[PDB]
Amino acid sequence: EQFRIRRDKRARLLAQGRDPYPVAVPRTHTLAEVRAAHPDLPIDTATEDIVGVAGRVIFARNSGKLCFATLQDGDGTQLQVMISLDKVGQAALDAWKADVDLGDIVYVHGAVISSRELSVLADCWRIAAKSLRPLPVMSEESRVRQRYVDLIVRPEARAVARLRIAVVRAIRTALQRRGFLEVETPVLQTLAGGAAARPFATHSNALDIDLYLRIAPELFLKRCIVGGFDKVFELNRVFRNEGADSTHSPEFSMLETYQTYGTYDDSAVVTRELIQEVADEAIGTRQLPLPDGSVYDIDGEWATIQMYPSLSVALGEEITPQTTVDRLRGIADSLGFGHGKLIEELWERTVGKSLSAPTFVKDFPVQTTPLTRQHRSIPGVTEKWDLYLRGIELATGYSELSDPVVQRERFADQARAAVLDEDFLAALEYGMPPCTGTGMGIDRLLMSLTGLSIRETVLFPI
Template sequence: MSADIQNPDDDLPEQLRIRREKRQQLIDAGLEPYPTDLGLTHTLAQVREAYDPEVLGADHHTGDVVTVAGRVIFRRGTGKLVFVSLREGDGTSLQAMVSLDGVGEESLERLKHLVDIGDHLAVTGEVITSRRGELSVQASSWAIAAKTLRPLPNEHNPLSDEARSRMRYVDLIVRPEARDNVRVKAKVLQSLRRTLDERAYVEVETPVLQHTNGGAAARPFHTHVNAFDESALLRIALELHLKRSLVGGIDRVYEIGKTFRNEGVDNTHNPEFMMLEAYEAYGSYDTMADLTRALVVDAARAVGRTVVPGRDGSEIDLEQPWRRATIHELVGEAVGQQV
């Protein structure tokens, strides 16, 4: 056969092709581009917490050796000293100083030529402060923790709303607000469960696949259970099975789970979303109102935001007493007469 076999990498954009070539160079040099054990001793946050550069002063050597890792978000230097900024998931960053004296000529040149912005890097070295007083790790060795094959988005050309929605992992990398939202949501979920658990509510898991939907008026997703040769629906609400649990003797019950509605999509509606439903035997709308307030206030305390902006631009202190009103009272106010 005279036709040459085409290399699939030939059709890749230049940046992707170059990064794949660098990964291959690491492999050819006997270096693992995705090692499983880095021997880490500290997180970047732990180093930051343990050493105060203002107390240490400029150009200080602690004598303490650590091994840390993070994503490369900045790199400068082409001579005998390279500065690398590492960042971990919570946003904590730390400078690594990789010098000719510290790691040797071959290792330094490999760093310059094979490490890109976005790569994950592990660094072992002494905790020091630089001449400018910046807390740093003076590297005695380094290793690739994970070689990235795609470049990060340019900060001057941010992701569109659609791209952020379709590539959440990229959004998490480039936007601290996105990472903060993940942690805030986790704290809110922990708070909700804690508040309910303290009030003797029992968390249950109810079926996602159902034969009939209830608890809401919405268009469901349809599927088929091959083992039973029967049609099924993804649940549109949590209500019915929770009420069956109540009937069965679980006097206080709740569930936090995903529900699915095959309807419109916009900034406030998604086909797949999370719900919280709770039910209490012998309760009333007054007891549920008390529970609702406790859930909201406890969650606000958990994230440190008990004062929130109102729709009219005013500030609302969630810890202050809440107004109580019936539907009839509110409708009467709106129409200007007693209902």
């Protein structure tokens, strides 16, 4: 019902030649600027520094000859205003009382004082916007269907939104210090490749074909290495037409990075530094506090373990690239398609779940890693690592497969479970120098650093 009273203050303001939504207002400082300015003001004393400020009224204490409001800026910073009879306007005070609700954006010019809390004592005042919905005094999934309200009433939502923006800045800073170049590769592709996922298709009207949103930029980033890029990345959305869960969404921000003439050994060291540098820039500590109330140390060096050896110790027997699927299925049952899949799953179900300190696992089954180079010395495994931080599958890197005839086979196997990415394979046969790629999910980065769910990390999900 308050929806109607509010619409009728707008109307009776328009009729009266009052502007409820004025083009401009001369806001001289932010309330943060007015705070940093008067940090220690002897309380109940006045100062002749004049300011125009605008804020959202989020409390009002109306009292005859004197109204007090709390004006909150968009960052949450608060200044109190004092709409007084005596300064200017009995009619201003009546206008104030009658026209000004809660959730109203409001400009006030005048003197900066501290009362018997930092306030502005009004020379003038005007409305900048008239709200036709009162602020509520909120469930998770209603907070997320209405982030704009969440950001006004919930300081934490402000803190989280700024945090992600700061993490993303810190990332670009870290990669740019190291000579990486940020490139833009296609989101619409004739076939989507470079990961294991079911793509979003769309019809094009220009071309009268179906196109596919990128599952991953890897294949196009590898054409940039062929093309002569030394050090490239791309920090931008990927689209995977699968289910949502606590570490999975169909649209999410993902970093990929390629460095020429380094291996997975080299890109492990960079991923650690990059994460540690981000924590410092954006959180101020490598001793990460959690909603637990616990503290997760990500400082220092990080453990590396091999999948097969670590799996062997966990199962009490030698598991090699040679170990048959009949053997592996057997073990699987004893707990509760093919070899590559079984190793990773058995590993995930035994070693994976027990991890707590930040660990790299490396040397992976050749079957489940079609784009990564065969290991230099160990037959049957690829030079790939997964990074687990606070138990989250955070990041991965490869020594990259630059052999086209091998790469052709890897795909010819995939498919038989038969059109390949012939222009990608074309690019490799022009010669791709030896290089190491990485990938990392921005949402998993935040979750691993904060505790925050994926539906708190993204501004506008669904």
